[PDB]
Amino acid sequence: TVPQCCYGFCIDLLIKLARTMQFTYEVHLVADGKFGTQERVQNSNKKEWN
Amino acid sequence: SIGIAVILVGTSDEVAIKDAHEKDDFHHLSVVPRVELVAMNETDPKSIITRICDLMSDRKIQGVVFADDTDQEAIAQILDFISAQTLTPILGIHGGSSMIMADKDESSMFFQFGPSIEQQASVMLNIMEEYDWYIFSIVTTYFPGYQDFVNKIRSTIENSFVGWELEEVLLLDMSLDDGDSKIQNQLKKLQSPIILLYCTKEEATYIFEVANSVGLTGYGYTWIVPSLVAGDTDTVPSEFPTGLISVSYDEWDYGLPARVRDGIAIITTAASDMLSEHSFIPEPKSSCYNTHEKRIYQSNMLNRYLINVTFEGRNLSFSEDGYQMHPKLVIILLNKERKWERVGKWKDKSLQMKYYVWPRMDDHLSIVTL
Amino acid sequence: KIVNIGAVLSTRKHEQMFREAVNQANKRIQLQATSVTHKPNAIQMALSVCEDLISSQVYAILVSHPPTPNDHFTPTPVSYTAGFYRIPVLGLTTRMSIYSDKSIHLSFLRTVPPYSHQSSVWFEMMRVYNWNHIILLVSDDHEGRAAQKRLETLLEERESKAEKVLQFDPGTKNVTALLMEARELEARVIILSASEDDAATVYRAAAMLDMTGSGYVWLVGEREISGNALRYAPDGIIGLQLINGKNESAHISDAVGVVAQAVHELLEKENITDPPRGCVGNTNIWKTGPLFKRVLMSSKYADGVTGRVEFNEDGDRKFAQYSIMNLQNRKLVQVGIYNGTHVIPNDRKIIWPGGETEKPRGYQMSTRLK
Numbered sequence: 001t002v003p004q005c006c007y008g009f010c011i012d013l014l015i016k017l018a019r020t021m022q023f024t025y026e027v028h029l030v031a032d033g034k035f036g037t038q039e040r041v042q043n044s045n046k047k048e049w050n
Numbered sequence: 051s052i053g054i055a056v057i058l059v060g061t062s063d064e065v066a067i068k069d070a071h072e073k074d075d076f077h078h079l080s081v082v083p084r085v086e087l088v089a090m091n092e093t094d095p096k097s098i099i100t101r102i103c104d105l106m107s108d109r110k111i112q113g114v115v116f117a118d119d120t121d122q123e124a125i126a127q128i129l130d131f132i133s134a135q136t137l138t139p140i141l142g143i144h145g146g147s148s149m150i151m152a153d154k155d156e157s158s159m160f161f162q163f164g165p166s167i168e169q170q171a172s173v174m175l176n177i178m179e180e181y182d183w184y185i186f187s188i189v190t191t192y193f194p195g196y197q198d199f200v201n202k203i204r205s206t207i208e209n210s211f212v213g214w215e216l217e218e219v220l221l222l223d224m225s226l227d228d229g230d231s232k233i234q235n236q237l238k239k240l241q242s243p244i245i246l247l248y249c250t251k252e253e254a255t256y257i258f259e260v261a262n263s264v265g266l267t268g269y270g271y272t273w274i275v276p277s278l279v280a281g282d283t284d285t286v287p288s289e290f291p292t293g294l295i296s297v298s299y300d301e302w303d304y305g306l307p308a309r310v311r312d313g314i315a316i317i318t319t320a321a322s323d324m325l326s327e328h329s330f331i332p333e334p335k336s337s338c339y340n341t342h343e344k345r346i347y348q349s350n351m352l353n354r355y356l357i358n359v360t361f362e363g364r365n366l367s368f369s370e371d372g373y374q375m376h377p378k379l380v381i382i383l384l385n386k387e388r389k390w391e392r393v394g395k396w397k398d399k400s401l402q403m404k405y406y407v408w409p410r411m412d413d414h415l416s417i418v419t420l
Numbered sequence: 421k422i423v424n425i426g427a428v429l430s431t432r433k434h435e436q437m438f439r440e441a442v443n444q445a446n447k448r449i450q451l452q453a454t455s456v457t458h459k460p461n462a463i464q465m466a467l468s469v470c471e472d473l474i475s476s477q478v479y480a481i482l483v484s485h486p487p488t489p490n491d492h493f494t495p496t497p498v499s500y501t502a503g504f505y506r507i508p509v510l511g512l513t514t515r516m517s518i519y520s521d522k523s524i525h526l527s528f529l530r531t532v533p534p535y536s537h538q539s540s541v542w543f544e545m546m547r548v549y550n551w552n553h554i555i556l557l558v559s560d561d562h563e564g565r566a567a568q569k570r571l572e573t574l575l576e577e578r579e580s581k582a583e584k585v586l587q588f589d590p591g592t593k594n595v596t597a598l599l600m601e602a603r604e605l606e607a608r609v610i611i612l613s614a615s616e617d618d619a620a621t622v623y624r625a626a627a628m629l630d631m632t633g634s635g636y637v638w639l640v641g642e643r644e645i646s647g648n649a650l651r652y653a654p655d656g657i658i659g660l661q662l663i664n665g666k667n668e669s670a671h672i673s674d675a676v677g678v679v680a681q682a683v684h685e686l687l688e689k690e691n692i693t694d695p696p697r698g699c700v701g702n703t704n705i706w707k708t709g710p711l712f713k714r715v716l717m718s719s720k721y722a723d724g725v726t727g728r729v730e731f732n733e734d735g736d737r738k739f740a741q742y743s744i745m746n747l748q749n750r751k752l753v754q755v756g757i758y759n760g761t762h763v764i765p766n767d768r769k770i771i772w773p774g775g776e777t778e779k780p781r782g783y784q785m786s787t788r789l790k
């Protein structure tokens with residue numbers, strides 16, 4: 001991982017939420033770059049999200 | 051110079067086994083194994099305990115292969131009990147010792163010849179897509195492995211491009227008193243033409259009789275059962291519906307003489323490859339009594355290597371659960387004169403049937419198109 | 421008719437007490453007593469069970485823990501040997517959770533509940549002290565898995581998941597990394613389930629990481645209090661104690677009282693056959709024992725010397741009594757009583773870890789998000 005810069009519609013909405021709700025945040029990018037679905041892994045009964 | 055014992059139960063061609071024992075070429079590995087053919091009745095667990103105790107205390111036995119001819123199920127659990135308590139490796143090649151158990155103990159030292167429940171379910175699912183039987187239902191009782199069986203099909207058919215349709219699953223209990231009326235009432239809800247069963251012989255006969263009381267065992271219904279339902283081909287309860295389909299371990303052309311040689315080869319090669327590399331071999335104080343302090347020398351390395359062997363162009367690697375992981379299976383069918391007929395053979399996920407269309411045993415029409 | 425019963429004990433005084441109990445119960449159908457001692461190995465246990473089962477042809481066997489601390493491996497041979505012929509066995513002082521599996525042990529009942537059942541004491545303490553954020557720290561064993569599974573099933577009723585579950589390998593000497601992760605969480609209430617030797621390793625690391633000060637709450641079990649755990653244990657830890665789990669004499673009397681109730685109701689039924697006295701001879705399953713266990717489990721004992729005795733549909737004791745203990749100034753003082761369904765504290769006061777006298781919030785809301 002390397003540091004990068006982020007901005008856009010969602011970034012400045014988070015800034016508005018933080019100021020009103022009085023919290024401090026750290027942000028990072030998703031590792032695999034996927035939104036998320038439920039799959040099965042290595043022949044197991046469990047089912048886990050990615 | 052490892053002592054290997056051979057145990058037979060009941061009547062058997064011992065002379066044939068002795069003649070076929072000296073049919074392997076093991077000159078490329080320092081084994082010089084010992085063979086001890088002992089025979090005894092099926093008296094009880096205590097006789098078995100005494101037999102292995104006396105044999106082990108007799109002359110430095112390092113391994114055992116166990117054969118049988120009965121249909122007992124708890125014998126596998128008993129042999130697993132001895133296997134866990136004393137670190138001697140034993141193998142179950144035939145009879146009731148080949149029946150699968152609930153699970154093996156963590157410290158147990160036991161391996162069996164035969165497929166697991168998951169592999170049997172995978173095999174019997176292939177039979178249903180050879181002939182396009184996409185409508186089925188599952189009925190089973192309380193047995194050590196019932197959940198895994200239904201879980202296997204539920205996992206397999208949920209992610210498929212084929213159109214699978216499952217119509218309810220039954221988990222009826224046969225141990226209830228006066229629950230036979232409820233069992234019969236709930237058996238009427240079945241509508242699919244294909245039924246999968248997971249039981250044992252006695253309750254299989256009970257369920258077959260109850261269903262025949264309802265009558266859905268006659269023309270448009272087909273039943274598939276695993277290997278342990280039939281158990282032995284020679285005896286038929288005569289309440290089994292005609293046309294029953296069952297999977298079974300290949301015994302017609304896989305003679306008992308080959309199994310003993312295969313097990314001896316596995317044990318010898320495992321001991322040799324473990325002896326040569328590690329420069330060590332376990333020869334414990336061969337006494338059956340007073341084994342509380344016998345655990346001084348760990349023998350898990352032998353267990354670690356017993357699951358990967360090969361010889362004479364064959365794969366005999368076991369699994370972590372203690373099953374063959376690569377068996378040879380056959381499919382048997384019940385015809386008019388009560389007997390099992392060999393229909394198809396299964397090997398390496400590949401099915402090979404002797405027919406192209408299932409014989410029917412009217413409102414069934416032919417259709418032509420272009 | 422005359423029907424005798426058997427038992428497995430290891431004490432001369434216990435044998436005398438059993439003789440007195442059977443003589444007293446004779447005044448309540450004539451029933452005798454047959455008991456033997458314990459052997460230093462399991463195969464001797466199995467052979468002695470089968471030999472003495474043949475001698476007396478008993479219908480049930482009573483088994484208690486030996487003077488051995490673990491009391492885990494010792495009951496196993498008796499269960500298998502009895503189970504093979506399908507004869508009920510009553511367990512008195514066993515706490516391991518392996519014996520609660522019906523598949524492995526077909527015929528086994530409990531006089532006291534298993535170690536894993538002491539998680540409803542924990543569920544009630546969370547409801548009375550409005551605690552909604554907890555950390556579950558368990559070991560990777562069959563004991564830990566059942567305790568985890570019970571807690572998640574109980575918590576799922578309110579739809580309130582546990583914050584996090586952390587698993588450590590049994591018999592480890594380094595848990596610093598696991599404890600570091602738990603220190604960066606919202607909850608401040610820690611539930612621990614391990615063995616006495618293993619628990620002491622966790623306690624030393626917790627005190628080094630300053631996780632035993634103010635604002636922290638520890639809920640442990642019976643094993644985490646006994647043994648050498650008290651040598652390394654911060655003050656304010658709340659433990660549990662079974663009311664009469666260490667009194668084998670009390671269990672013997674009431675166990676006889678409930679089996680004698682069943683033997684009166686067993687001979688008053690049709691198609692009753694004596695279980696075979698042929699240890700060596702018979703390999704068949706006695707028809708009596710599937711029906712016998714059904715009535716025995718439902719045989720609700722009206723009153724006894726250790727409280728009401730009942731059984732769930734697992735062969736386990738119901739409505740047990742627990743004492744909520746507390747460690748202050750290196751000495752444990754009892755604080756409350758749980759009669760199966762509710763918690764009633766006494767006039768004594770509770771000292772929480774760190775020396776404060778006030779229920780803690782058990783929560784620390786974080787103002788930094790990811």
Ligand SMILES: *[C@@H]1O[C@H](CO)[C@@H](O)[C@H](O)[C@H]1NC(C)=O
Binds near residue numbers: 764
């Ligand atoms: C158990 O505790 C409850 C607390 O509400 C009490 O009502 C009850 O009488 C106690 N005893 C029994 C036998 O339930």
